[PDB]
Each structure stands twice: as C-alpha cells, then as structure tokens.
Amino acid sequence: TALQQAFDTCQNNKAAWLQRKNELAAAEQEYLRLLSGEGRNVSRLDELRNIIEVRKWQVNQAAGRYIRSHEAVQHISIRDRLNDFMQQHGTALAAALAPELMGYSELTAIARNCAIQRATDALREALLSWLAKGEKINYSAQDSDILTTIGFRPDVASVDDSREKFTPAQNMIFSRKSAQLASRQSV
Amino acid sequence: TALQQAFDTCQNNKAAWLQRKNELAAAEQEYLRLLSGEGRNVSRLDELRNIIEVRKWQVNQAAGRYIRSHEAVQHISIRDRLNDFMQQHGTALAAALAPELMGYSELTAIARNCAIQRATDALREALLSWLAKGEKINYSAQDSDILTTIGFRPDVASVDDSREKFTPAQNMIFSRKSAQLASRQSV
C-alpha cells in the first residue's frame, strides 16, 4: 500500500502546486490592473510586490516538493518492479553472471565491490545493446494506471518554476514572510 | 566460436606460464647446487644470476598474460550469457524498468546518460538484495565446462607472480636480455 500512499501524496502535491500557481497569477494580474489604474496607491503597490515575491517563492517550493514526490513514486515503483521481476528470474540472471557472482557470500569487501561493479557495467552494456534495437516499452501491467496518471515526467511548468535556487537565509526569510502574510490574511 | 578461441588461448597461456615457472625453478636449483659447491665459478655464478633474473621476468610476463586472457574469456562468457538471457527476458525487464527508460531513442545525451545511470543503480540494488537472500549461484549450463576448467579465479601463483610491477625501462631492458639469452642458448 506504500505505492498508493506515494501516489495520492503526489496528487495532493500537484493540486497544491496548481493552487499556488493560480493564486500567484491572480495576484499578478491584480497588481498589473492596479498599475494600469490612475490611482497611485504606493503602499498598495509595494505590498502587492511583496505578495508577488512571496507567492513566487511558495510556487517554487511547491513545484520542488511535487517534483521530489513524483521522483520518489517512480523510484519506489522501479524498486518493486525489480523486486518481483527478479524474484521471477533470479536463478537465470545469476547463472548468466556466475563467474563474478559465485562466492559472494564469503568474498572480502574489495573483491565483493569489484565483482558487483563488473556485474553492474555488464548489465549496463546489456541494457545499451537492447535499447539499440529500439523496441517500444510498455508499462508493467500491475502498476500501469498509477504511473500513467502521474505521467512519465513532470510538466515543464514544474521544472521551470523549480529552476530558481534560494540560499538558506532567503529560505528562512521567505518562510517568515509567508507565515506573517498568512496570519494577516486570516485575520 | 569466439568463446572456444578465448578458452584455448587461456589454456595455452597457462601452459606457457607453467613452462616458464619450471624453467625458473630448474635454474634456481642449479644455481643453488653450484653455490653450495666448493668451486668459485664467479663468472658462472654471475651469468646464472642473470639467467635467474631473465626467467623471473619471463614468468611475470607469462603470468600477467595468462591472467589477462582468463579475465577476457570470463568477460566474453558473461557478455554472451547476459546477451541471450536478456534477449529471452527483455520484455519483462523493460516492463520492470519502463517508468524510467522510455524515449531513449530520441532523448538528449545528458538525459540518456542519467536515465542509464538510474536504471544501473536500481539494478545494482536488486542484485544486492538477491545476494542478500543468499541462494547459491551455479554456472550457465551451455558453457559450464569451460568456466569450470578455467576456474572461478586465476591461480594464486599467477596472482602473486604478477605483483612485481616492472617499469617500462626495465621492460625493454629485460626483453633485450631475454633475446640475448635465447641467442646464447641457441649457441
């Protein structure tokens, strides 16, 4: 059930990021409209700029969180698929890799590491050889629907909104300003 | 037929290494027998020491070549076994790795390399788990005989006879000395 909770937390993160983007766009269009207005409202313009900055930071944080959650869902799905696949074909896979994998239970640390790295890049070469053909890859039947719903890759909006990087001091100041803004808006 | 060629090359290299070892042992025994004698034979002792050094260098070269050929034949066997195993189970393996390897036919270089790396350490984790359960690994039935004859690892004598690490200068000096020794033996 870990896959299901990963999936619906990813969906919640997506919904939160969409809400953040929507409210940021609403604030931006309101600020532009007040710029077009005749009224000066200098204090209103400054506070709107502050709101725009803090909500852009919130959108960036939400996009980063959603991207991380999506990557976690993909990683756990990969882990489970390798698990049940190789429970299926472990004997054959080890037979294909016996000269580097036999005696693993008693080999020393350096020998174990070198053997697993040799098996590793042998597997990498095999994957390259298969991908050279260009066969179409379909999803696992057991977990196809969840991974199709989350998509192969996050949207370009997610990666671009998360492109901006913030220093820890910027992170704490933006968190404090966002908390203050939320408290003020609630009251 | 490449596997058979590598196997017989490894066998020939092992035979040559054994021949060099027995020649060096005979030279050492004869040198000790002369040294234990009351005769001086200073020139004889010096030329025997030269022959001993030449034989030791030849033994090192033969052991290194034999180890390299054994590694090569093991690598070829692994490549062929993993190739036909993955030709058998490619659909299932790609389905297990579907959420991460799609689009390889047209993705950019950096994305392709990162996807290959992520699939690679996912496979590493799966193989590590299998080694954790501890089921005994057997050689592939198609080429079990060759892999058993060549052994799981090269002989420890070849392992500790190839730790001299001669410098290139010493390498061609010993090559010239060995050629001169062969010419003198012909005389």
Author numbering:
A (entry chain h), B (entry chain g): 4 to 190
Structure paper excerpt:
A ρ variant harboring a P167L substitution has been observed to bind Psu more tightly than wt ρ38,43. However, in the ρ-ATP/ATPγS-Psu structures, P167 of ρ does not engage in direct contacts to Psu that could explain the higher complex stability. We, therefore, also determined cryoEM structures of ρP167L-ATPγS-Psu complexes. The results showed that ρP167L associates with Psu in a similar manner as wt ρ, with a preference for the complex II constellation. In this arrangement, a single additional ρP167L subunit can join one ring at the center of the complex (complex IIlocked). Incorporation of this additional ρP167L subunit leads to an interlocking of the two ρP167L rings, due to refolding and domain swapping of the central ρP167L subunits, most likely explaining the increased ρP167L-Psu affinity (Supplementary Discussion). Such refolding and domain-swapping in ρP167L only occurs in complex with Psu, as it is not observed in a cryoEM structure of isolated ρP167L. Parameters listed for ρP167L-ATPγS-Psu complex IIlocked refer to the ρ1-ρ6 subunits of ρ(A), which retain the standard conformation. Also in other complexes, lateral access may be restricted due to conformational restraints imposed by Psu binding. Such conformational restraints may be more severe for ρP167L, which exhibits higher Psu affinity. Furthermore, the space in the central channel of the ρP167L-ATPγS-Psu complex IIlocked is reduced due to ρP167L refolding.
Phage satellite P4 polarity suppression protein, Psu, a building block of the viral capsid, inhibits hexameric transcription termination factor, ρ, by presently unknown mechanisms. The ρ hexamer adopts an NTPase-inactive, washer-like, open-ring conformation until NTPs (preferentially ATP) are engaged and RNA is bound at the SBS, leading to ring closure and RNA entrapment inside the ring. Our cryogenic electron microscopy structures of ρ-Psu complexes show that Psu dimers clamp two inactive, open ρ rings and promote their expansion to higher-oligomeric states. ATPase, nucleotide binding and nucleic acid binding studies revealed that Psu hinders ρ ring closure and traps nucleotides in their binding pockets on ρ.
